Amino acid sequence: ELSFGARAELPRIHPVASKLLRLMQKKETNLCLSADVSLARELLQLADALGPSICMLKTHVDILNDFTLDVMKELITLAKCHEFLIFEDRKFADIGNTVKKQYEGGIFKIASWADLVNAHVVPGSGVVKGLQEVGLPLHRGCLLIAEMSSTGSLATGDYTRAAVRMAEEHSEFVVGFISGSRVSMKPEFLHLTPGVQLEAGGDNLGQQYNSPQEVIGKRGSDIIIVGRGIISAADRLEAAEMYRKAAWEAYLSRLG
Amino acid sequence: ELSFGARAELPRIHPVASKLLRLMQKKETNLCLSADVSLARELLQLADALGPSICMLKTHVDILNDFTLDVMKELITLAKCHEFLIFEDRKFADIGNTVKKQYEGGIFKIASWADLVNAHVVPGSGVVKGLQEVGLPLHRGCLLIAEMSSTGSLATGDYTRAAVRMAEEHSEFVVGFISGSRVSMKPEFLHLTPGVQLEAGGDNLGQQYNSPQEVIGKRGSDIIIVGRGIISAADRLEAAEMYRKAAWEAYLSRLG
Ligand SMILES: NC(=O)c1cc(=O)[nH]c(=O)n1[C@@H]1O[C@H](COP(=O)(O)O)[C@@H](O)[C@H]1O
Ligand SMILES: NC(=O)c1cc(=O)[nH]c(=O)n1[C@@H]1O[C@H](COP(=O)(O)O)[C@@H](O)[C@H]1O
Ligand code: PRO
Ligand code: PRO
């Protein structure tokens, strides 16, 4: 098993994956903040304060009450200053002709500002081919949803295997997974795991939590995605630091 | 097998399904227009001209270059005038806590104007429970994606069975399916089928077409969803009429 810095240099690495792995190693962070907020000012204040602690900021642009492209310009300034990627959790999930338009156009213009997006694999590989027509010219990357954290997830067994094959067959554009565990044996792919909290439990609507030690250390994932465990805390910076230190030490211990 | 008008009166019918089935019977239309356009003016001109020919207008609000809530006010005026439902093809596809926010909030405020939305079932039933927290108070309905039209679709076998169970167990809010065929034996549920064109073929990005006669007549679906077969034609009104007459006669012949 290679360090994040050595994985950044692998022959088949995607440039977006390489940039991410290099800043993960430099900053000693494998934490992705899930910035599930409704106010642009709160998104930007979190991005600025937590930027040094995170390798990535996951957005849901469609829950911002005051979205504008100027907000995303300000977010890019912070991502460049603090060195983290912007991942829009769009969950593209239809035929290629549709998702192509959803990625480039509309009021969000997601491909213009998002380093990473993700897709569900349920439509078959046309979802990736459609996104790649916009993403490859813009030097972007994509994550495929191979497993989900929620109760009753159908992203199991042959579904998960199909996501891994689709990723491995589209390595020009697909850089990794949303998953609960390592699902690819190829070290060029990133594994990002949501459903993470320091304490046991869940929510009222099917979310299930596992710890950073479990996710990174035992299940072999690379990055934890954390929303409410940070966002609902009083001191979001200290919370982010606790999650960062947990995920980083779990990674170091696994690497030995 | 009951007529659309008799299905509208079934004891367990959802009010949104009842309204739809009644206007389908009144207008002799089981056509849903897929208005996959980038300009508000084109969306509204299509809605006005084709409104009499359709039971439903499917939107992708996120590909409109000039979305505003005032556009959706003008669309509602046309839906009321011509009697069709508005279905936003949002493909909600994550944990309940996230989709709840995506449905009510953000710049689109989808629940404020969409009679129907749809969801992927991959996250498990929390996707429905989250949407229902916003949709049930607003008297809205939801469709679950049980099958997909595209090459390599993973919405097959046990996945499809899980979608049908999730619908049948959430009948207060779920009114039907996106599917290629009848998947529920319960007549209170609507079946809407995309991937429809009069001529054989597909597209360059995994779309596959079947005819209205095949979809409605042999596969037992209720409604055809048609985009490019209408939208790319020179005379969109005549194209809509050809699709309407095809789907309506296939329905009549199956009913006998
Ligand atoms: N698409 C994902 O990353 C995703 C896939 C999945 O299986 N499970 C899951 O929790 N997520 C997304 O990650 C975030 C979790 O937020 P939290 O529960 O930590 O507040 C939240 O934004 C949620 O939408
Ligand atoms: N979500 C759906 O309705 C859906 C599910 C699915 O399996 N297959 C599918 O084609 N659709 C959506 O229907 C529309 C088809 O557009 P067309 O190919 O007729 O131009 C287009 O807007 C596409 O996104
Ligand atoms: O010098 C570095 O940071 C990288 C890490 C692996 C080898 N070179
Ligand atoms: O009169 C009608 O239109 C409805 C249809 C079934 C029975 N009553």
Swiss-Prot record, chains A, B:
The active site is at residues 89, 91, 94. Orotidine 5'-phosphate binds at residues 34, 58, 91, 94, 98, 149, 207-209, 227-228. UMP binds at residues 34, 36, 58-60, 94, 98, 149, 207-209, 227-228. GO terms for molecular function: identical protein binding; orotate phosphoribosyltransferase activity; orotidine-5'-phosphate decarboxylase activity. It catalyses: orotidine 5'-phosphate + diphosphate = orotate + 5-phospho-alpha-D-ribose 1-diphosphate; orotidine 5'-phosphate + H(+) = UMP + CO2. Keywords: Acetylation, Decarboxylase, Disease variant, Glycosyltransferase, Lyase, Multifunctional enzyme, Phosphoprotein, Pyrimidine biosynthesis, Transferase. In the N-terminal section; belongs to the purine/pyrimidine phosphoribosyltransferase family. In the C-terminal section; belongs to the OMP decarboxylase family. This is Uridine 5'-monophosphate synthase. It comes from Homo sapiens (Human). The lineage of its organism: Eukaryota, Metazoa, Chordata, Craniata, Vertebrata. The chain holds residues 224 to 479 of 480 of the full protein.
